[PDB]
């Protein structure tokens, strides 16, 4: 029955901007419960990404018919959170009160991939052994399209949103034009079961990660189709691959219980190894505001928080869920992190209140 | 869509204060920096005079001083954005700032992959002066060694990540070490208050002994587990020689010899720090965002977050070991951003949130009382701005074609909150007006504390004498030279005797009767006359110069008469004009001295000492207008050498060449006259008998009135700051004079070109010792918003005050408030209480019983003047004051909004005339974040929606709504369209159709952008959307459906960008002196700028000029303006600097001609474009 509202923090930050040059002018938020109106969004304290370590459980959201949640994504404005479940269902929850809003039978198959275009017009989705579906802002389907004859694991948009790449369980990554429903190019340099794919925010290249032990990570030229390079980052299957918005970093999460960070320009050595988990690492989400902060979730119901400059883990929750965490989604403001796991539930996590024990 | 930027008002927010030997090693002076401005002040014995000032194409991020090996002067270290570092030093030869060196440390390998830098370049200087250090990116410590040819050794960079040095809070060099020992306060495992229960005591200090010869930096000592909320560190000078660490709730003293000494300052330290902290009994404050400086070895003064000034004393043993701390609440002053000690007993508090203050502290274990000696005005930060019509304007100026405008700005913050009333132009308060035909020149003379006795007017065939008393009456019977014209009239003998010079000779009279008259025949009639008591000089149209002296009688009876003293100043070069100068200062040396400045036909200029007539100064090329006049061994129409400032301190040389005005500040340098002259930049345009009229004590102000097509006031007070204020509400003025009368106390009189003589005074309550004439209305509370109601001519000001937070709202269950129960040492949170006052521009006072108090925890998020539909007006609309509020009870409670519509109505009364009437006052489901008007409808952003209402009677009927982004904080509408600004998702362009009652998202900008404020760029037949962002930039977007750059007309396109260098929160537009609108704006640093749309071809011409100026001219600190004006911190440019274009006016005629030759254009074309851009922007 709890709720978190970001408007007071945004208002306090707007009142701060006029007479504060930067964070060295911001007064101290005392670790006391009375200092509730002094809170500001992440953009109000860029020198302290720790504020965005959301380990305070707020609300667990569970469908009437419980199914393992495979993907969670906020709408671009942050109004409603969508959960794509194994029932092929989209469950729309309110982003401020976390109560049930709506539910739609969007897929006949477990929807595995859900992404919003860089422009807030389109939501693209894909299901297990299924199709790519386009969605307007009003959750009305406009196009259903046969993409792969096998399971599609993830999809991502090009910076201009004119094209998108999908990785599937056929060991391939296909690149399509968005305005049409046409298969532009194929990338077949993998073994089997490509489980993650990501498009670069500026440069034209796509990263993929699969079950293969000989070619786990692979870079690709979208327009040409050529394989730029192969990255042997892990021995187990690479579960997620995400490029930081700065365009320089590559983050990976694999079943070998590890997260990894690489410099996109020099791939000879690993830039950083995030070690800290009990089992595999299944999900990763870069923070939308803090450049070095990110969150991860594993086969155990644990989630962790890391910063790029720090070797050790920054924080987290050990029994956050009871199944494996499939998806992590930051609220666009960066103050709420939602987790979608295999235990048929999806939880919301906020920043710790000053004065909490 | 092209435009030019102009700076109408320089920033006034200071940031850095320093005390060093800037000019020489004999006298020390104050050096204060604010954003892009740097100032060097001297102290008078109570006033600060501006000794020097310099502008940069960059924002100073850090400032320091060092004494180099040559030891001529102190060198200044200036940090600039990203990793630029400039060493500069005063140049005694040019009175300028010379660049010793400039170092760039901007390489991506130093950024470790990060693209957004949250660390400013922090410079520290070792006290012994052996090296400097600059922390950049929080990762790279640059070390600049100093010699003990070039005065700097090669720098070297230390990667601090080589220990686990991360998140450096502060760094400071220490006293008493044989190697430069730098202490670094940091935290390896960063934490935040909400997570203090999991991570605390995360701070640490590490001292580094730097050996620059071997580049070895070992750790001499270190400390861990310091309180998580450590804020800064201060190095203690000898002989104590420790380090004082500030922390939000604690004070630490650390040193190698003694274990740490920790003191808790309030109760909040309980449960947050395991560090052993003894409780200070009589103290209950915080040290976050506080400043502090040592007034001696034993005591340091601290200005807190709230302005409290405390004095801390260190208690020591016989071996100087800090045993205890002693605080004393000394006083209360401004919110200090910087602080520095000057001479013993004087302390400067620099502020950007208020007026900076010079204080004098005197003692009476020993307490100190603080006294305000001087203040530096500051109109920043400019939170919001409104434009209105002044309440008082002289009748003679009413019905003027141009509107009389005035700016009202929410300035400052907190206790230093205020309203700033800005007017750029001088308005004359006309007491009376006489219409006198034939009079072309005038003089005012004191009759025998100093009240003018006679007004002497000249006409081609006669002259007129006016007795000045309770009435001004023509004097026909007097013994003046009523017949024939009068070429000069002045005072001699310390205002005892008066002199009237006519083309036939000179006349010495006392009162109304004449005592003496000398006919002067040299072959030509007398055309010019100068008087520097007791010397008089005249010259004819041919070029014959004559000098007379007022000599007292031998018997001491004080009877005086003019004595001829022919000057031996023969030359083969014919004299054009000349002037005399009586020096009460001490600059003119080779103590009252007498000098004659003279211009000749060959183009040279000479200075002679009197009465010996000895040459002491010579410039070979004067009419060219060189930037520095140097001693050696185009028609110069007028010249005047006068002293201004406190007690004739600063000398200035004004020159009128053909259609050109030159100002020269005199400065000491090195038989010959030990003086040089430096050109002063200005935009006064002479293009269309004496144009320069000196005055003293016109309103307590001394200066010079510059006549001509655009008259100006040139003022210098006890502070050596040149003020140039325009006076153009009346036309071109051709004659001016001071006038002190019983009906015109400390005033003036001037002739316009329509033959009207105006006896006027300067309007009171305005400080003219500022970049713009300003009236400061202190509010003692934060001024959030200001709106001008056109129908009533009254301002509605939304403000706030701080109270102790006593309860916590817990449930959005049911509404419950937990009463905060703590102990006495607890420090309560700050809770804002908002109010809406009515203020009248007549007296600039609040209107009684016209104040609206808003609910507890209710924040006013917006307040605008809106024009809503009404059937009682001929135009169909009328004005109200609309306000949107949000009730913020914390994160756990739903934020509900409220809309508040008020009207200012006239009531039978002075200030009682107007009153506030709440026409609408209803709570809204969802927070009300922004509002505006559109075609008589009220548009308001509520939550993540935007609703459009129509107002009928006293109720609001919902007509339209639309889904929007995360948080819309600003909304402005051009007719039919609306533009909304998100906190993170840039701008959105919407349309409202009256036929459909619907809102349609026309287009937007999908790229993320932290918009500060938004407005419009209104060029002829073009519409642009002007946006400011967090990176101090301005961007003009456009909606171009056919451009194809948009995917389908849905993407807004950036067509212009410019790095202004300041945060802009309030715009406003004015018509052009067409269909163009100048888009002015006020910055958060106390400055006013403008964007002026311009034609593409003129833009190309001035862009060529701009590239020439950036590549061919030296710039302070060695910075470059092209890179300064670039985007971020992609670019389409299309916005000219203007501040850089002004330097072309500063070049000499030869330099301008050669520059125009290299460009390929005519100097006259360039000048036409520049002067036209200056002419269009003349407002307020």
| Cβ contacts of A12 on chain B, cutoff 8 Å | 888
Q: Which chain B residues are Cβ-neighbours of A265 within 8 angstroms?
A: none
User: Per the CB < 8 Å rule, is A11 touching B784?
Assistant: no
A8/B890 CB distance under 8 A: yes
Asked if residue B1051 lies in contact with residue A160, where contact means CB atoms within 8 angstroms, the answer is no
Of A218, A209, A117, the closest CA to residue A158 belongs to A117
Q: CA B955, CA B921: separation in Å to the nearest integer?
A: 9
- CA-to-CA distance for B464 and B455, rounded, in angstroms? 8
Number of CB atoms found within 10 A of residue B908's CB: 5
Q: How many angstroms separate the CA atoms of B298 and B863, rounded?
A: 50
A contact residues 283-312, partner B, Cβ 8 Å cutoff:
291-292, 307-310, 312
Q: Are the beta carbons of B1061 and B7 closer than 8 angstroms?
A: no
Cβ of B118 within 8 Å of Cβ of A15? The answer is no
**Pick among B246, B886, B891 to test the A interface (most A CBs inside 10 A):** B891
Residue of chain B with shortest Cα separation from A8:
B888
At A156, give phi and psi (nearest 5°): -145, 150
Rounded-to-integer distance, Cα A218 and Cα B213, Å: 48
For B673-728, what is the HEC assignment?
A: CCEEEEECCCCCCCCCCCCEEEECCCCCCCEEEECECCCEEEECCCCCCCEEEECC
State how far the Cα of B327 lies from the Cα of B69, in Å rounded to an integer.
40
Q: Does A203 touch chain B (CB under 8 A)?
A: no
Using alpha carbons, list the distances in angstroms from residue B142 to B145, B473, B641. 10, 76, 49
CB B744 within 8 A of CB B696: no
Nearest CA in chain A to B1010: A43
Give the closest-approach CA distance of A308 to chain B in angstroms: 10
Interface size, chain A vs chain B, as Cβ–Cβ contacts under 8 Å = 212
Q: How far is B295 from chain A (nearest CA, A)?
A: 24
Nearest CA-CA distance, residue A77 and chain B, Å? 5
The H or E element spanning position B184 is strand B181-186
Running DSSP on this structure, what letter comes out for residue A44? G
For chain B, say whether A349 makes contact (Cβ under 8 Å).
no
- Which of B1108, B1064, B1066, B1073 has the alpha carbon at shortest distance from B1092? B1073
Instruction: Give the 3-state secondary structure of B354-376.
Output: CCEEEEEEEECCCCEEEEEEEEE
Whether A332 and chain B come into contact, CB under 8 Å, resolves to yes
Distance of CA B531 to the CA centre of its chain: 37
Contact B866, B796 (CB under 8 A): no
Q: Which helix (H) or strand (E) holds B1098?
A: helix B1096-1112
CA distance B252 to chain A (A): 18
Nearest residue in A to B61, CA atom: A21
- φ, ψ dihedrals at B396, nearest 5°: -55, -20
Q: To the nearest whole angstrom, how far is the Cα of B966 from the nearest Cα of chain A?
A: 5
A248/B1006 touch (CB, cutoff 8 Å), yes or no: no
Q: How far apart are CA A245 and CA B902, in angstroms?
A: 46
Residue B650: strand, helix, or coil: strand
Contact (CB<8Å) B895/A5: yes
Say what the alpha-carbon torsion angle B645, B646, B647, B652 is, to the nearest 10 degrees. -20
A3 CA: distance to closest CA in chain B (Å): 5
Out of B112, B118, B809, whose CB is closest to A47? B118
Asked whether the CA dihedral B570, B572, B576, B577 is positive or negative, the reply is negative
Q: Burial code of B685-722, b = ≥16 C-beta within 10 A, e = fewer?
A: bbeeebbbbbbeebbebbbbbbbbbbbbbbbbbbbbbb
Half-sphere exposure of residue B430, counting CA atoms within 13 Å on the CB side? 17
**Pairing assessment for the beta strands B1064-1071 and B692-695 based on DSSP bridges:** unpaired
Contact yes or no for B247/B233 (Cβ under 8 A) = no
Residue in A21, A119, A248 closest to B113 by CB: A248
Distance CA B673, CA B607 (A): 8
A247 chain-B contacts, CB cut-off 8 A: 115
On whether any CB of chain A is under 8 Å from the CB of B1012, the answer is yes
Residue in A10, A120, A263 nearest the CB of B983: A10
Out of B195, B271, B893, closest to residue A352 by CB: B195
> Of B288, B381, B983, which is closest to A27 when you measure between CB atoms?
B288
Structure tokens at B942: 């509520």
Secondary structure (H, E, C), B814-843: CCCEEECCCCCCCCCCEEEEEEEEEEECCC
Closest by Cβ to A50, choosing from B191, B895, B969: B191
Residues in A closer than 8 angstroms to B115, CB to CB, are: 246-248, 291
Tell me whether B201 touches chain A (CB under 8 Å): no
Portion 309-328 of A in contact with B at CB < 8 A: 309-310, 312, 315
Residue B604's Cβ-count burial label (10 Å; 0-12, 13-18, 19+) is: middle
Query: Per the CB < 8 Å rule, is A3 touching B969?
Result: no
Please work out, in degrees rounded to the nearest 5, the angle formed at the alpha carbon of residue B1165 by the alpha carbons of B1163 and B1166. Answer: 65
- Taking an 8 Å cut-off on Cβ atoms, the answer to whether A32 and B268 are in contact is yes
Non-local CB neighbours of B845 within 8 Å, separated by 6+ positions? B839, B911
Are the Cβ atoms of A4 and B891 closer than 8 angstroms? yes
**Residue B1132 touches partner A, C-beta closer than 8 Å:** no
Q: Could B891 and A5 be called an inter-chain contact, meaning their C-beta atoms sit closer than 8 Å?
A: yes
Reduced to 3 states (helix: H, G, I; strand: E, B; else coil), residue A40 is coil
Q: How close does chain B come to A241, measured CA to CA in Å?
A: 18
List the beta strands (DSSP E) in B895-944: 896-906, 914-924, 928-934, 937-942
Instruction: Resolution in Å, one decimal, please.
Output: 2.5
Residue B356: strand pairing partners: B376
Q: Which residues of B touch A316 (CB under 8 A)?
A: none
**E-strand stretches of B447-574:** 452-459, 462-468, 472-474, 488-492, 497-502, 505-510, 513-519, 526-532, 535-540, 545-552, 560-564
- Whether residue A55 and residue B192 make contact (CB cut-off 8 A), yes or no, is no
Deposited experimental method: X-ray
Tokens of B467: 């007795």
Q: Do B808 and A7 touch (CB under 8 A)?
A: no
Distance CA A93, CA A3 (A): 13
* Nearest neighbour of B286 by CB, restricted to A12, A28, A247: A28
Measured between beta carbons, the chain A residues lying within 8 angstroms of B249 are: 30
Give the residue on B whose Cα is nearest the Cα of A315: B198
Q: Do B886 and A11 touch (CB under 8 A)?
A: yes
Determine, for residues B892 and A25 on separate chains, whether the beta-carbon distance falls below 8 Å. Answer: no
Q: Tell me which residue in A24, A31, A271 faces B193 most closely, judged by beta carbons.
A: A31
Contacts of A50 in chain B (CB under 8 A): 190-192, 195, 199
Number of residues written out for chain A: 357
- Homologous superfamily (CATH) of B3-382 is YVTN repeat-like/Quinoprotein amine dehydrogenase (2.130.10.10)
Structure tokens at B828: 């309560």
Question: Closest Cα to residue B596, out of B579, B575, B583?
Answer: B579
Cα B487 from chain centroid (whole Å): 42
Among A1, A5, A42, which would you mutate to test the B interface (most chain B Cβ atoms within 10 Å of its Cβ)? A5
Both tokens assigned to B387: 């434009």
Q: Using alpha carbons, list the distances in angstroms from residue A324 to A70, A301, A316, A349, B39.
A: 10, 5, 15, 17, 63
Report the C-alpha gap between B423 and B1178 in whole angstroms. 11
Listed by number, the residues of chain B in 75-104 with a beta carbon closer than 8 Å to a beta carbon of chain A are none
Query: What residues of chain A lie within 8 A of the CB of B1029, using their CB?
Result: none
């Amino acid at each position: 029955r709890k709720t978190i509202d970001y408007n007071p923090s945004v208002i306090k930050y707007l009142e701060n901007r006029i007479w504060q040059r930067d964070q060295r002018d911001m007064r101290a938020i005392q670790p006391d419960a009375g200092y509730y109106n002094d809170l500001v969004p992440p953009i109000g304290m860029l020198n302290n990404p720790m504020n965005a370590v959301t380990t305070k459980f707020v609300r667990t959201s569970t469908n009437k018919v419980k199914c393992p949640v495979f993907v969670v994504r906020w709408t671009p404005e942050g109004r409603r959170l969508v959960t794509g479940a194994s029932s092929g269902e989209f469950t729309l929850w309110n982003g401020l009160t976390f109560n049930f809003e709506t539910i739609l039978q969007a897929h006949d198959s477990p929807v595995r991939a859900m992404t919003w275009s860089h422009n807030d017009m389109w939501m693209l989705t894909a299901d297990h052994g299924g199709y790519v579906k386009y969605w307007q802002s009003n959750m009305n389907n406009v196009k259903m399209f046969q993409a792969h004859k096998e399971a599609i694991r993830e999809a991502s948009f090009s910076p201009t949103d004119n094209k998108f790449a999908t990785c599937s369980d056929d060991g391939t990554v296909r690149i399509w034009d968005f305005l049409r429903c046409h298969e532009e190019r194929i990338l077949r340099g993998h073994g089997a079961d490509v489980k993650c794919v990501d498009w670069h925010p500026t440069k034209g290249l796509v990263v993929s990660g699969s079950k293969d032990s000989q070619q786990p990570i692979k870079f690709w030229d979208p327009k040409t189709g050529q394989s730029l390079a192969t990255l042997h980052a892990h021995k187990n299957t690479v579960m997620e691959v995400k490029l930081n918005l700065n365009g320089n970093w590559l983050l990976t999460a694999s079943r070998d219980h590890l997260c990894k960070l690489f410099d996109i320009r020099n791939l000879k050595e690993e830039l950083q190894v995030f070690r800290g988990h009990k089992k595999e690492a299944t999900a990763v989400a870069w923070h939308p505001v803090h450049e070095g902060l990110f969150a991860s979730g594993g086969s155990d119901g644990s989630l962790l928080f890391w910063h790029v400059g720090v070797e050790k883990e920054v924080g987290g929750m050990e029994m956050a869920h009871e199944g494996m965490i499939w998806s992590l989604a930051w609220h666009p403001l960066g103050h709420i992190l939602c987790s979608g796991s295999n235990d048929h539930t999806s939880k919301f996590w906020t920043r710790n209140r000053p004065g909490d024990k | 869509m092209y435009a030019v930027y102009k700076q109408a008002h320089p920033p006034t927010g200071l940031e850095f204060s320093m005390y060093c030997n800037f000019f020489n090693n004999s006298e020390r002076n104050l050096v204060v920096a604010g954003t892009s401005q740097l100032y060097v002040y001297r102290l008078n014995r109570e006033k600060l005079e501006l000794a020097a000032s310099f502008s940069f194409f960059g924002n100073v991020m850090s400032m320091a001083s060092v004494q180099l090996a040559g030891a001529k002067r102190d060198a200044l270290l200036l940090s600039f954005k990203d990793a630029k570092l400039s060493v500069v030093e005063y140049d005694p030869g040019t009175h300028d700032l010379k660049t010793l060196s400039l170092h760039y440390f901007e390489e991506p390998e130093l950024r470790d992959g990060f693209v957004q830098n949250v660390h400013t370049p922090r410079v520290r200087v070792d006290p012994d002066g052996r090296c400097a250090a600059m922390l950049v990116y929080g990762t790279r410590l640059v070390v600049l060694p100093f010699r003990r040819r070039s005065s700097f050794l090669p720098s070297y960079i230390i990667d601090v990540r080589a220990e686990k040095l991360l998140n450096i809070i502060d760094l400071q060099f220490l006293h008493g070490y044989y190697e430069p020992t730098l202490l670094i306060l940091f935290e390896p495992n960063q934490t935040w208050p909400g997570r203090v229960a999991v991570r605390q005591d995360t701070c640490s200090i590490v001292a580094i002994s730097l050996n620059i010869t071997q580049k070895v930096h070992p750790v001499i000592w270190s400390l861990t587990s310091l309180p998580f909320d450590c804020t800064q560190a201060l190095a203690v000078p000898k002989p104590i020689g420790g380090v004082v660490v500030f922390a939000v709730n604690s004070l630490l003293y650390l040193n190698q010899s003694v274990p740490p000494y920790g003191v808790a300052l309030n109760s909040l330290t309980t449960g947050t720090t395991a560090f052993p902290l003894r409780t200070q009994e009589g103290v209950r404050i915080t040290l976050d965002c506080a400043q502090a400086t040592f007034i001696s070895y034993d005591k340091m003064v601290i200005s807190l977050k709230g302005g409290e000034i405390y004095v801390l004393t260190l208690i020591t043993d016989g071996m100087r070991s800090v045993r205890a701390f002693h605080f004393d609440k000394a006083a209360a002053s401004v919110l200090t951003t910087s602080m520095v000690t000057m001479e013993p007993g004087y302390l400067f508090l620099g502020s950007r949130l208020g007026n900076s203050l010079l204080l004098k502290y005197t003692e009476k274990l020993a307490t100190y009382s603080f006294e305000v000696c001087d203040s530096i005005l500051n109109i920043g930060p400019c939170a919001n701005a409104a434009v209105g019509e002044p309440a008082f304007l002289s009748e003679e100026f009413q019905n003027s074609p141009e509107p009389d405008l005035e700016i009202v700005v929410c300035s400052g913050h907190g206790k230093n909150g205020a309203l700033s009333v800005l007017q750029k132009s001088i308005r004359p308060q006309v007491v009376t007006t006489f219409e006198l035909p034939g009079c072309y020149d005038m003089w005012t003379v004191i009759a025998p504390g100093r009240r003018h006795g006679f007004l002497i007017l000249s006409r081609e065939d006669s002259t007129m004498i006016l007795q000045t008393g309770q009435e001004i009456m023509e004097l026909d019977t007097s013994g003046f030279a009523t017949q024939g014209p009068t070429v000069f009239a002045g005072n001699i003998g310390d205002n005892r005797y008066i002199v009237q010079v006519s083309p036939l000779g000179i006349r010495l009279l006392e009162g109304v009767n004449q005592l003496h008259f000398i006919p002067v025949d040299l072959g030509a009639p007398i055309v010019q006359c100068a008087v520097a008591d007791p010397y008089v000089v005249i010259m004819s149209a041919e070029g014959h110069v004559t000098m007379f002296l007022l000599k007292s009688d031998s018997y001491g009876g004080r009877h005086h008469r003019l004595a001829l003293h022919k000057p031996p100043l023969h030359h083969q070069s014919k004299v054009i004009t000349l002037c005399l100068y009586r020096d009460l200062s001490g600059m003119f040396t080779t103590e009252p001295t007498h000098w004659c400045l003279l211009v000749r036909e060959n183009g040279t200029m000479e200075i002679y000492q009197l009465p010996d007539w000895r040459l002491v100064f010579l410039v070979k090329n004067f009419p060219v207008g060189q930037r520095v006049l140097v001693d050696s061994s185009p028609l110069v129409k007028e010249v005047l050498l006068v002293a201004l400032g406190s007690r004739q301190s600063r000398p200035y040389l004004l020159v009128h060449v053909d259609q050109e005005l030159l100002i020269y500040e005199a400065f000491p340098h090195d038989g010959n006259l030990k003086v040089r002259f430096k050109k002063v930049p200005h935009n006064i345009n002479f293009r269309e008998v004496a144009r320069f009229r000196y005055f003293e004590d016109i309103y307590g102000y001394s200066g010079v009135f510059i006549c001509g097509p655009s008259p100006h006031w040139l003022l210098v007070t006890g502070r050596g700051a040149l003020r140039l204020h325009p006076m153009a509400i009346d036309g071109p003025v051709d004659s001016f004079a001071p006038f002190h009368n019983v009906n015109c106390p400390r005033g003036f009189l001037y002739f316009n070109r329509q033959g009207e003589l105006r006896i006027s005074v300067l309007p009171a309550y305005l400080s003219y010792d500022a970049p713009w004439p300003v009236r400061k209305i202190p509010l003692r509370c934060t001024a959030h918003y200001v709106a001008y109601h056109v129908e009533s001519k009254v301002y509605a000001v939304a403000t706030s005050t701080n109270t102790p937070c006593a309860r916590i709202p817990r449930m959005t269950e049911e509404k419950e408030f937990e009463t905060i129960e703590r102990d006495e040492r607890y420090i309560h949170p700050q809770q804002e209480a908002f109010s809406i006052q009515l203020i009248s521009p007549v007296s600039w006072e609040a209107i009684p019983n016209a104040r609206i108090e808003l609910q507890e925890w209710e924040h006013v998020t917006c307040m605008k003047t809106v024009s809503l539909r009404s059937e009682e007006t001929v135009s169909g609309l009328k004005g109200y004051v609309a306000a949107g509020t949000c009730l913020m009870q914390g994160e756990e409670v739903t934020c509900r909004g409220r809309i508040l519509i008020m009207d200012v109505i006239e009531v039978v009364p002075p200030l009682t005339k107007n009153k506030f009437k709440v026409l609408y006052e209803k709570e809204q489901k969802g927070p009300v974040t922004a509002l505006c008007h559109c075609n008589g409808h009220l548009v308001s952003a509520i939550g993540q929606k935007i609703f459009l209402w129509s107002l009928r009677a006293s109720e609001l009927t919902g007509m339209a709504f639309i889904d929007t982004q995360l948080y819309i904080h600003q909304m402005i509408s051009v007719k039919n369209f609306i533009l909304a600004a998100d906190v993170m998702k840039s701008i959105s362009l919407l349309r409202y159709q009256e036929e459909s009652k619907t809102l349609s998202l026309v287009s937007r900008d999908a790229k993320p952008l932290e918009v500060y404020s938004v407005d419009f760029m209104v060029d002829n037949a073009q519409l642009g959307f002007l946006v400011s962002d967090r990176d101090r930039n301005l961007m003009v977007y456009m909606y171009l459906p056919e451009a194809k750059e948009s995917f389908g007309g849905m993407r807004l396109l950036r067509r212009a960008d410019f790095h202004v260098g300041a945060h802009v929160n309030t715009f406003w537009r004015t018509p052009c002196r067409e269909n163009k609108h100048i888009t002015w704006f006020a910055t958060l640093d106390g400055g006013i700028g403008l964007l002026l749309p311009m034609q593409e071809k003129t833009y190309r011409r001035l862009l060529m000029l701009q590239n020439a100026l950036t590549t061919m001219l030296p710039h302070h600190a060695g910075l470059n303006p092209r890179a300064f004006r670039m985007l971020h911190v992609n670019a389409v440019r299309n916005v000219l600097d203007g501040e850089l274009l002004n330097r072309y006016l500063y070049l000499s005629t030869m330099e301008r001609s050669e520059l125009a030759k290299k460009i390929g254009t005519t100097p006259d074309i360039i000048l036409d474009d520049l002067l036209e851009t200056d002419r269009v922007t003349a407002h307020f």
